[PDB]
Design an enzyme around this catalytic site. Structure first.
Site, PDB file in Angstrom:
ATOM      1  CG  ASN A   1       5.632   1.163  -8.186  1.00  0.00           C
ATOM      2  OD1 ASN A   1       6.578   0.875  -7.339  1.00  0.00           O
ATOM      3  ND2 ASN A   1       5.593   2.248  -8.797  1.00  0.00           N
TER       4      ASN A   1
ATOM      5  CD  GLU B   1      -4.997   8.137  -1.870  1.00  0.00           C
ATOM      6  OE1 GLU B   1      -5.979   7.617  -1.288  1.00  0.00           O
ATOM      7  OE2 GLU B   1      -4.583   9.510  -1.263  1.00  0.00           O
TER       8      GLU B   1
ATOM      9  CG  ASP C   1     -17.292  -8.882  39.336  1.00  0.00           C
ATOM     10  OD1 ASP C   1     -16.570  -9.174  40.241  1.00  0.00           O
ATOM     11  OD2 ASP C   1     -18.337  -8.186  39.246  1.00  0.00           O
TER      12      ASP C   1
ATOM     13  CG  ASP D   1     -21.074 -10.195  31.821  1.00  0.00           C
ATOM     14  OD1 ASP D   1     -20.781  -9.571  32.843  1.00  0.00           O
ATOM     15  OD2 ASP D   1     -21.269 -11.400  31.781  1.00  0.00           O
TER      16      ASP D   1
ATOM     17  CG  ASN E   1      12.680   1.085  -5.988  1.00  0.00           C
ATOM     18  OD1 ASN E   1      13.472   0.253  -5.764  1.00  0.00           O
ATOM     19  ND2 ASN E   1      11.471   0.291  -6.036  1.00  0.00           N
TER      20      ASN E   1
ATOM     21  CG  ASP F   1       1.320  -2.455  -4.921  1.00  0.00           C
ATOM     22  OD1 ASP F   1       1.979  -2.284  -3.904  1.00  0.00           O
ATOM     23  OD2 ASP F   1       0.912  -1.414  -5.603  1.00  0.00           O
TER      24      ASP F   1
ATOM     25  CG  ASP G   1     -20.046  -3.911  34.075  1.00  0.00           C
ATOM     26  OD1 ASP G   1     -19.850  -3.294  35.050  1.00  0.00           O
ATOM     27  OD2 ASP G   1     -20.299  -5.029  33.856  1.00  0.00           O
TER      28      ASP G   1
HETATM   29 MG   LIG Z   1      14.501  -1.498  -5.553  1.00  0.00          MG
END
Ligand SMILES: [Mg+2]
Ligand SMILES: [Mg+2]
Ligand SMILES: [Mg+2]
Ligand SMILES: [Mg+2]
Ligand SMILES: [Mg+2]
Ligand SMILES: [Mg+2]
Lengths: 894, 900
Positions: free
Chosen positions: A732, A329, A371, A639, A707, A736, A643
């Site tokens: 944790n 996640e 081009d 463009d 860890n 983060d 194309d």
């Molecule tokens: Mg550690």
């Protein structure tokens, strides 16, 4: 067992993966289903009188309340894969992670009996982690959606402004179109939805995407075809995904969104995106690697602690808590946040990214096809000479070109602009008041000319056609020489060829003009009416190369990008332009040489060839497709009207804000200005962004694996958990919070020097290398707290656990400054100031947490002052060891 | 009392004011120093054999120990006004100001008798303020000196690259040259010091600056003229400040620095720089205004407190302490620190500022005079047609042009590069082997041609000249038509004229080429040999306009800068280029038209004229000078040999890093790349820098005037000093620490949308307007401490004074966010992050100082907690009142002085 691993939450397929782009060739599932083809056929021949009542439409247009009512009834002009989910749905899907639920359930089970405020605080920590992830994901996806909506194809509508009831012509995004709405179409506008032509003049639409026919098809207001028998070929309806080539029209929207021909049973709604691109495959592979690590490690920790301490409902919670650091996640949050920060910083550099994964390709591109016009030259011509076949200046050639450039309704060319500007006001006014337009034969690549039929009276008409010299000469039988008309013999043909070749070798583009007089006729002129013409002369003009093209090309070559020129112009002009900007053209390959080569032969030839000349759009698409043959990432810049396939056939497509609608629709990157310097700077910054994303994933995974390894190796001997799972969750979460500012890190120029190749298997090697290094000092801290501080018995366990906490959080936060770069830190490479600030703040919070009043609630004990020198020694030793060991990973692995 | 004003300390005359350039010309203040003159006359004719012994020079060059020995004996190659003072002298002159001395003397006098540790801490505060000012000035002066040294003229020398003795050719800055040094000279190199020519190859130098003659003169290795009688006209010595038009040479340095003929007597040394520029005058006016404010206010406070409290040695100290807030000694720190921060920033925008004051002009520019080549168009040409008179492509014309371009030793041209690149390798090498160079007649504006005399044998020589069409046609008598040499009649003249006019109207520049055959001889060729030539043809080439010239011109017009084109080219090509780039040429004025015009007529004409064509450098200089007629700041951008008088004539001179040596020497701004977009962005940044400087000056002045006014109006009623002067010194020091971050502030885009104009008298109006507004609240705080907190007696005076202290420092610190911008703060305009951080830090320090353990040492007493709501109310009321009152100042006088 990959079919059972449903723990991965895929990112929405609008941030990654391309849009459907209704150009999915002629193949159709049973040629649409019934009740759709029949509905279109009925709508085509439906009288215009009863057309207003069917859609509740009025000639004045639609007012506000009416347009919201119609949008509520028929939905929005989008595809079912483009509507974002509500924020509460996103928060719920972030919280229903099969790991957060398990963490909460295990917390309840472990602490439902005689110990509350513990399951509650564990659930609260899980909620805080979920909220942080959701906030990052939501902010980044909102920014990404805003950036995508910044460059969106717009349609011109009537609507109602000036609430007192005044009509207008508003430019609104094509998603706001509702059925029964009136729009107007000019040259270069893509069809935004299924239409019904109300009134049009000289309207030609290119339908090669749908019906597979290259030549544009005239679309009239009222049907003039005897029988239809097919919805795709009726002349009164225009379908979404096609472009307008020339002419003007005003039509009414009949279908919208999924109800559009393509959007129902002709693509998009047929199944889903079964095949993922490279970026999605890499993300899935990284997620599978992380799942494999967790499923191999966490059960072992659970079994060990359950067998040792005999508390299974707590051992499982502890193993899950250590495993959560290795969850997949983190991937959606990391990818979305880093790539969105990169996309926003690109948007500040005149580079707009439509889908996030394109950034990867925009950093991985090593071949850039484009081009010569607009990117190498200035697109505005400075010198122009209108001369007959004898070299003398001629006003007749200029006037014929002015007629052909004024009465044409196609896209404005550089020659058209220069001819309209180089003609004096008096003669232009006289020609405009003397000649009137009758018919227009547009431009197509089979003949490469363009014709306009005008008339000064009702007796005779004049067809004036202009185009490339060879194509014009192919259909000219007489030439106007010295004021007379003489047959075009071979001597004059070779003289003109030689003179024009000499002009071409100077970088001068030569465009020939022919005129013919015909009796008045009441029928539409066709391409067969361009025979036995009278060649008036030619116009030689110079589009000068940009001053910022040679340095840009040198910078692109320095970055590792090979620039290839795919042009439909002459070989000589393209070669001269390439030589004027420092590009080595080598030996040129014309489009007529590759029509006989095999796929292998052309793929091998295109690797050494630099300049391809006289290419049709099919040739450009084929070359771009075959340039991806040997693991190269190909980027196509264009463009133009044609194309659309090449921009989609490349690994990345780049277009310009001033492009045609289909060019913007089919592109992945949009440059606000057509420059190569902007492209090179954007490539550099995107390389930095993707490097930052890889670094963030890499460091997080490696530290969390370290860890987990420490827990796995050093928990059987201890008579209690080395760290309480609440402390692990706090660690944790704070890590983060520290890592939030990694997207803003600095990247060494040696990392972004060459095109980036992303191998997801390198993450496993990095984790294996840099986990045990952390585990060694974790075991050292365990021994220190066991023997030096006498945290021997479970009764005095809180000192031990907290003793690891300040080591677990701080080192994991300090190691970032060591393994981020490949050089020696703080002297040769420094982290960014936001990262420095976040590291310092998180270290301070981790140090002051055991001393805070909350420490009693979090089961954390205060630390004696004699522990700080040991902690400093451990941190310094860890940093020095990792700095000395980085070289072995650099050499043996990479 | 103008003579009595010794308080003002001027900045060193290198950060401000332009360095003397050797363009004196007819300026001979000392006419001729016979002692100096005799030396040259001897050096010129001295034999080369004994020249080595005189200067202790060897043919292989000089090694290290020798070069430091010569530098120590003869000094450095600089003028006396360019040597920075040692850091300890700077610190001493920063400390010895008559305000830092009087403060310490009065502190000792007041607190020597039984009250020590007070004079000591007062002297310590004075020393800390002096150190802060000195650190700021030293850092910014070092940055400015580094920036000036980044773009400096260099010279190519032998020296000694290797320890073994291998010689080299090092590009060393011209200041490192010592007498008796061997250098080599090429085209475009300026003479860095007085030289003795050792060897020469067709060396032509332009001495128009010294001798006043425009035609370049020949410098030979050995004299070839009978009698010299004049050091300036000897053909074997080259003097500093002149440029090498063409040729190559190797010479020896004979004089250096002040000893140079220019450096000593003839120029610079005579008299001094009596007249200051506009920036120095403005700084002096501001300093005089501050001195007048102090001299008006401080004696009144002294007299009031002496008559009230009867402690004159304390009253004078207190008045001086409140007055020091209005000292002019901040001006050297304010100017040097704010401008340098801008200049360094400009160095990251490819804009190097040689002297700081130029920034004021660089933001005040409203007229910009440039040439069309390089700035408006690319310097590389795309198309070229080498044709004869009949229009047919001709190889002979290309070969003659190739000979002329290959064998010329002058500055490289765009046509020369195009001709050298457009000739195939085989034919180029065949021409190089077949033809050998003999002589060269360089380019000068009187005839506007350039000739090269070569030969394929020893029998005849071929003279190949090229130049503008009319100049070549004036000296052509025959033309090679259809392979035959036919007389050039009038019909062909008119036909060629109309054909080339048609070519020019298309934006094509036409360069005609003529050739002649002469019998071989031994003497040198002269400008009279260009007669009866044979016109081979012409080369019409296209120089395309830059992609970014039109947006840059639009931005320059949007910023208030009127761009004018001064070009020596044809009017048709220049008009076509101006039309292509979007500039409105209007009516073109050629150089011959303005010769008969008067100064008033030309000044009136130049204001409504955009494009000037066919201009000699004298015309360019005259137009630039007269464009400053009515309060206009003129900037001239040039990179040519003859652009030095025009660069120095303008209010600001801008050149390019790739320019000739004299163009860089005469310039004030150096652009690392020749671009108008860079110029516009740099102009905007310089406007921001000058706005920050003016803002820095006005805020510190207004707040300190308000404090002095509060003291003057209030201290009479109180039975003690409203604040101890130690607390006032602490307040001023902390306010300066807060204000250190002003150079990094943000400036509204409204303040930089027009060419800035600086009025030193506006500071007085601002101070008068914004002083009482903060005296109002000082008196309110005095009433609050007197009645609400019962500080009615001297025994409890410490509570009163400290009670004002926290009000004095924070408000003065907070008011900056209110009066820095004309708009309402924090919603439309917000201060920069460093300024916000410094404001927060200084407010925190001011709040925490009375509670700190140092408070007893500083005679500060802890504040009750009920005082904080009143303090917050006072600060909020002050901010609201000043915000609602700024509108009156904006309406009556305007926030800033602007417009052209
Ligand atoms: Mg550690
Ligand atoms: Mg449109
Ligand atoms: Mg038609
Ligand atoms: Mg030099
Ligand atoms: Mg000579
Ligand atoms: Mg005040």
């Amino acid at each position: 067992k990959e079919i059972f691993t449903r723990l991965i939450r895929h990112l929405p397929s609008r941030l990654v993966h391309r849009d459907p782009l209704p150009g999915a060739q002629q193949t159709v599932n049973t040629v649409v289903p019934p009740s759709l083809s029949a509905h279109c056929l009925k709508m085509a021949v439906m009288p215009e009188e009863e057309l207003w009542k069917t859609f509740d439409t009025h000639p004045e247009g639609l007012n506000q309340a009416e347009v919201e009512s119609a949008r509520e009834q028929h939905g929005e002009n989008k595809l079912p894969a483009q509507q974002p989910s509500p924020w509460w749905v996103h928060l719920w899907v972030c919280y229903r992670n099969p790991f957060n639920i398990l963490l909460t359930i295990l917390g309840a089970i472990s602490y439902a009996t005689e110990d509350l405020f513990a399951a509650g605080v564990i659930a609260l920590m899980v909620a805080i982690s979920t909220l942080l992830n959701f906030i990052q994901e939501a902010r980044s996806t909102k920014a990404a959606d805003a950036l995508k909506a910044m460059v969106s194809n717009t349609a011109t509508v009537l609507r109602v402004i000036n609430d007192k009831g005044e009509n207008g012509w508003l430019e609104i995004p094509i998603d706001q179109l509702v059925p029964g709405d009136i729009i107007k179409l000019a040259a270069g506008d893509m069809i935004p939805a299924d239409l019904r032509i109300l009134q049009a003049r000289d309207l030609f639409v290119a339908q090669a995407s749908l019906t597979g026919e290259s030549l544009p098809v005239e679309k009239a207001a009222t049907t003039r075809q005897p029988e239809h028998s097919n919805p795709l070929e009726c002349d009164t309806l225009c379908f979404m995904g096609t472009t307008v080539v020339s002419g003007t029209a005003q039509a009414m929207v009949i279908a919208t969104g999924a109800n559009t021909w393509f959007g129902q049973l002709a693509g998009r709604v047929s199944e889903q995106e079964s095949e993922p691109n490279a970026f999605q495959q890499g993300i899935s592979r990284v997620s599978m690697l992380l799942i494999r690590f967790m499923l191999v490690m966490a059960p072992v920790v659970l079994l060990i602690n359950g067998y040792t301490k005999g508390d299974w409902w707590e051992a499982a919670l502890f193993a899950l808590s250590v495993a959560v650091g290795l969850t997949p996640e983190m991937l959606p949050m990391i990818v979305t946040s880093t790539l969105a920060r990169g996309a926003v910083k690109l948007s500040k550099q005149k580079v707009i990214v439509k889908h996030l994964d394109a950034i990867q390709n925009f950093g991985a591109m090593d071949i850039l096809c484009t081009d010569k016009t607009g990117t190498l030259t200035q697109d505005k011509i400075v010198l122009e000479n209108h001369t007959d076949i004898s070299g003398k200046t001629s006003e007749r050639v200029l006037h014929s070109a002015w007629l052909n450039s004024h009465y044409q309704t196609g896209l404005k060319n550089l020659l058209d602009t220069a001819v309209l500007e180089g003609t004096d006001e008096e003669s232009a006014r006289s020609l405009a008041s003397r000649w009137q337009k009758i018919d227009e034969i547009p431009f197509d690549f089979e003949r490469r000319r363009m014709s306009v039929v005008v008339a000064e009276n009702t007796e005779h008409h004049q067809l004036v056609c202009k185009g490339a010299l060879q194509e014009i000469l192919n259909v000219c039988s007489q030439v106007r020489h010295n004021g007379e008309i003489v047959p075009l013999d071979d001597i004059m043909l070779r003289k003109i060829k030689r003179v024009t070749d000499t002009l071409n070798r100077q970088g001068l583009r030569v465009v020939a003009v022919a005129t013919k007089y015909l009796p008045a006729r009441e029928g539409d002129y066709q391409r067969a009416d361009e025979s036995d013409l009278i060649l008036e002369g030619y116009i030689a003009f110079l589009d000068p190369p940009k001053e910022t093209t040679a340095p840009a090309l040198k910078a692109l070559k320095a970055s590792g990008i090979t620039v290839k020129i795919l042009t439909g112009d002459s070989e000589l002009v393209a070669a001269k332009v390439c030589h004027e900007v420092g590009l080595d053209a080598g030996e040129v390959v014309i489009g007529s040489d590759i029509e006989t080569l095999s796929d292998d032969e052309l793929a091998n030839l295109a690797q050494r060839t630099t300049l391809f000349a006289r290419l049709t759009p099919m040739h450009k698409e084929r070359i771009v497709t075959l340039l991806k043959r040997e693991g190269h990432v190909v980027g196509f810049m264009g463009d133009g009207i044609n194309d659309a396939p090449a921009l989609r056939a490349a690994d990345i497509g780049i277009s310009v804000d001033g492009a045609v609608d289909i060019a913007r629709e089919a592109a992945d990157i949009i440059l606000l200005e057509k420059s190569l310097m902007v492209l090179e700077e954007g490539v550099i910054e995107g390389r930095r962004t993707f490097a930052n994303m890889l670094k963030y994933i890499k460091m997080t995974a490696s530290s969390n694996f370290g860890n987990v390894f420490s827990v796995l190796v050093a928990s059987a001997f201890l008579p209690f958990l080395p760290m309480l799972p609440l402390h692990l969750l706090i660690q944790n979460l704070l890590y983060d919070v520290s890592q939030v500012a990694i997207p803003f890190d600095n990247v060494d120029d040696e990392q972004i020097q060459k095109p980036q190749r992303w191998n997801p298997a390198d993450l496993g090697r990095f984790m294996i290398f840099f986990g045990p290094i952390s585990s060694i000092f974790d075991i050292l801290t365990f021994c220190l707290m066991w023997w030096v501080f006498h945290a021997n018995t479970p009764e005095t366990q809180t000192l031990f656990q907290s003793g690891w906490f300040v080591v677990g959080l701080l080192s994991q936060t300090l190691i970032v400054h060591m393994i981020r770069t490949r050089r020696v830190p703080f002297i040769q490479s420094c982290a960014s100031w936001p990262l420095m600030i976040m590291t310092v703040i998180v270290m301070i919070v981790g140090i002051a947490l055991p001393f805070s009043p909350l420490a009693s609630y979090l089961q954390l004990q205060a630390l004696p002052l004699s522990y700080f020198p040991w902690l400093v020694a451990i941190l310094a030793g860890y940093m020095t060891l990792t700095q000395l060991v980085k070289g072995f990973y650099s050499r043996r692995y990479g």
